[PDB]
């Protein structure tokens, strides 16, 4: 058996030897050096651009401007307003204005300096409030007030629900913008073949299909002339879930130069690409009954979204979509505003749009619980979904729910009953719940295709090749797909060779975003494996003169149930299956049923709709040094309901990575702008946690067994991130008695709260 076995990732050997080739490692001796000229202004009109002197420099092969990129792009079909190279105006400092391809780095740098751009500088807006003022310039003509999207929804009778409450409290929380800091720098290698008018790209993307679509659209080139390959990828965490400007620019330069262009990006430029979690202000209002039952919820979320639309519409809907599906809440009112600002566009980052409002809800729920004299773990148990299946007011369908077990498990593992409220001054414990979808059940592009497709090939040699368009970004999708297919087939994992993410070879996949891969590609892989197993059982039965129903496949042996016959080896069955057939190729697909795609009557409900949710409960132990105000997270105990852990080893690592990223946002990470200038553009002043202050993290796996997931599986990588923020928020309150209203809980913020406490 392969499912449920702790399994090192199938591509780990190449990672530990340095043999794995990431985009910037790919050899291409004829490659030119690509460089982008970025706007030094946060907001400005482009009056003129003269590239004549740059083009005349020996060694410069091509220079491009926005005059050559008349088609904009955006990850959402309804909001494509970013041009590969700027047209008419720039909207953030770093916005691409021109690009060059040269024989070497020093020549490319000189060329950028020779390009003359005449700008008409405009006032820039750093905050949602400044951008929404009546006299502000509209960044985009179709949104005069700079509000990209507003959400105003009410589920149930909210006024009557609050009237039924015994206690009502409201508080505002603010959350700094954060960045993914995947360790690999952005890069694209673009090979344009002018003889055939074809383009091949190797790029740092989690969404090769989206890259294929946007490169074809933006270069006005038929999709059949483009091939997209994702080589090994050094993470992404959401950053690379939209086609990015540098990928399209590399393609544009390669075509202009009629050759190959390698466009590498610096770490500063990777921070400029951004697409991270937006600065968000959340007003949270909760009404409770005296016994702790939730009576009502009303929240407001305002996001500073940066300069272009991107994922914005989706992100702002997520601020309210996952207020549902965790606790039973009688009525919910949600109002939200996504506002353009003259800063790098925000986007999707692990937990996409649900982290900040989840943190705010958990923190106020705990605070109100204290006021009612109810333990923070108990107030969550009191409010769990009353029965399963459960359909939320947002039309989500919860078919598996491991929250009760997650809570009991972390309560026991952390010694919560024993220790909560009995720690030394300066130390504390906190608990929180969080959850996330196992893939958005509705694709972004309506094409009527299956939601995942996997192909298997088996020939005379007996090796099975599994072809998938899915992007393994370090999470292990190539191992996952192999495990589930091998389990169905009764073969060893070593018999499966995975070819992935190369558009000329592998079936299209929608991308590694919203934790959809295990659920969808896992089910498609099972589907393909069942098709192949059917073909082999048919051949074995014939060779064994038995009926197909009586054939059992045990560890690469096809036996006749009950019989004594030794049966046939897998290789003997392959040989039999080749007769009158030759090479076997099968296809498996998976499509989320319509009942899991929301309710058309609730506008935008597809966002937040999914086949199932991963749930996590976590307890965090932390201490606070009152002299410096420094908060130290010592340990986290986290129980995650992943439906069925296909690879427990990877589930543990994914959960530790998710909790840890939340710890970075909770304690030290934050971007900083000064009149449009990025101040945090390096990994010294953007404080990704080091191993020294990072907590130990103990993971407990809960298996609720989802009825529709592959072998019962749900996602295992995003549902645990958000809970860390409110859990450590509570630990800090127990340690030193202050209640933070702004993340990160860095020493500067803690010392201000301590000084105010003492002043009062």
């Amino acid at each position: 058996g392969t499912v449920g076995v702790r399994t090192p990732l199938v591509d780990g050997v190449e990672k530990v030897t340095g043999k794995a080739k990431y985009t910037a490692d790919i050899a291409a001796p004829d490659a030119l050096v690509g460089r982008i000229l970025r706007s030094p202004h946060a907001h400005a009109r482009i009056l003129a651009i003269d590239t004549s002197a740059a083009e005349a420099l020996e060694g410069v092969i091509a220079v491009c401007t926005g005059a050559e990129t008349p088609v904009p792009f955006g990850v959402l079909p309804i909001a494509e307003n970013e041009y590969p190279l700027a047209r008419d105006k720039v909207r953030y400092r770093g916005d691409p204005v021109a690009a060059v391809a040269a024989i070497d780095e020093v020549t490319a740098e000189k060329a950028l300096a020779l390009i003359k751009v005449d700008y008409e500088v405009l006032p820039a807006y750093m905050t949602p409030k400044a951008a929404m003022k009546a006299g502000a310039i509209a960044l985009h003509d179709d949104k005069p007030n700079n509000i990209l999207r507003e959400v105003h929804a009410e589920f149930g009778d909210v006024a009557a629900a609050f009237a039924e409450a015994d206690l009502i409290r409201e508080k505002t929380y603010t959350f700094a913008e954060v960045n993914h800091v995947h360790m690999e720098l952005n890069a694209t290698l673009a090979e344009y073949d002018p003889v055939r008018d074809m383009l091949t790209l190797n790029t740092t993307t989690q969404v090769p299909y989206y890259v294929h679509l946007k490169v074809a659209a933006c270069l006005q080139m038929d999709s059949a002339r483009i091939r997209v390959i994702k080589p090994f990828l050094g993470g992404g965490f959401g950053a690379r879930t939209e086609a990015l400007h540098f990928e399209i620019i590399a393609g544009l330069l390669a075509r202009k130069a009629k050759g190959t262009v390698r466009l590498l990006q610096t770490r500063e430029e990777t921070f400029i690409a951004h697409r991270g979690r937006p600065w968000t202000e959340v007003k949270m209002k909760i009404g409770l009954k005296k016994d702790g039952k939730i009576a009502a919820l009303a929240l407001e979320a305002t996001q500073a979204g940066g300069a272009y639309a991107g994922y914005g519409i989706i992100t702002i809907l997520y601020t309210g979509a996952l207020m549902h599906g965790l606790y039973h809440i009688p009525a919910i009112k949600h109002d939200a505003w996504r506002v353009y600002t003259n800063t790098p566009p925000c986007g999707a980052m692990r937990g996409h749009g649900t982290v900040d409002t989840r943190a705010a809800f958990e923190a106020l729920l705990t605070e109100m619980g204290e006021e009612l004299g109810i333990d923070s773990l108990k107030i969550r148990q009191i409010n769990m979904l009353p029965q399963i299946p459960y359909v939320t007011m947002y039309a989500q369908r919860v078919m598996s729910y491991g929250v009760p077990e997650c809570l009991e498990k972390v309560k026991a593992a952390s010694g919560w009953e024993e220790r909560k409220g009995k720690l030394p001054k300066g130390r504390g414990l906190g608990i929180a719940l969080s959850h996330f979808v196992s893939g958005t059940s509705t694709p972004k592009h309506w094409t009527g295709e299956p939601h995942a497709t996997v192909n298997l090939k088996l020939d005379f040699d007996g090796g099975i090749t599994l072809l998938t368009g899915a992007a393994d970004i370090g999470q292990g999708s190539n191992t996952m797909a192999s495990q589930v297919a091998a389990e169905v087939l009764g073969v060893r994992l070593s018999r499966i060779r995975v070819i992935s993410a190369d558009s000329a070879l592998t079936p299209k996949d929608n991308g590694s975003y919203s934790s959809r891969v295990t659920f969808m590609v896992g089910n498609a892989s099972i589907s393909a494996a069942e098709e192949l197993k059917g073909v082999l059982v048919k051949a074995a039965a014939k060779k064994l003169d038995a009926r197909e129903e009586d054939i059992e496949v045990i560890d690469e042996m096809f036996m006749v149930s009950g019989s004594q016959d030794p049966g046939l080896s897998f290789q003997e069955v392959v040989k039999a299956a080749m007769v009158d057939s030759g090479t076997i190729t099968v296809k498996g697909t998976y499509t989320c049923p319509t009942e899991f795609q929301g309710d058309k009557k609730i506008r935008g409900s597809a966002i937040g709709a999914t086949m199932g949710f991963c749930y996590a409960a976590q307890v965090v132990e932390a201490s606070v040094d009152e002299i410096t105000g420094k908060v130290t997270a010592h340990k986290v105990w986290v129980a995650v309901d992943v439906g069925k852990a296909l690879n427990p080893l990877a589930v543990e690592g994914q959960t530790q990575g998710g909790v840890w990223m939340g710890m970075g946002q909770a304690l030290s990470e934050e971007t900083v702008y000064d009149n449009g200038r990025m101040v945090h553009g390096n990994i010294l002043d953007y404080r990704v946690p080091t191993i020294v202050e990072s907590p130990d993290i103990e993971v407990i796996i809960v298996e609720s067994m989802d009825p529709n997931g592959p072998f019962g599986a749900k996602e295992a990588s995003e549902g645990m991130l958000a809970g860390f923020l409110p859990a450590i928020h509570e630990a800090v309150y127990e340690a030193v008695g202050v209640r933070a209203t702004d993340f990160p809980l860095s020493p500067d913020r803690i010392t201000e709260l301590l000084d105010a406490k003492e002043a009062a």
Binding site: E14, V16, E184, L185, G474, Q656, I683, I691
Partner: protein, 157 residues
Amino acid sequence: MKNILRLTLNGRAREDLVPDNMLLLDYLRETVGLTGTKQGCDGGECGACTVLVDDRPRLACSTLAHQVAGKKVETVESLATQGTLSKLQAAFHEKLGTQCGFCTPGMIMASEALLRKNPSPSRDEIKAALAGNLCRCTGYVKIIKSVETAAAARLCE
């Protein structure tokens, strides 16, 4: 201007004409073609370019190639014996101290330096030695486990 650079790299004698201003990182990746050593930042902040110079860790992006003349330099490509993984490499693979794999060559070289100097490190000594190596995937937990596992394996060998 180029000058002669002599050193031992991954067990082999090298004698190359190298620009005086060339960083060790660029010499390894571009002159020799050893792409295991990575670049994760714009200078000295991430540890992804960590290599060994006379058994001690060194940041290849913040070292001039000419500064290692006459020394023993080792990159991740040197650890395996032909295709067989070293115990440290096997531990990172088996314990999942590596996910995306990008910080792994630097993390493993820093770990190799630690184990050559302190064969049986405490958890705190492991954290102290890897303090400048950033990883965004793992939350570090299993990286510590990989180093402990490797230390034990090397000791009973």
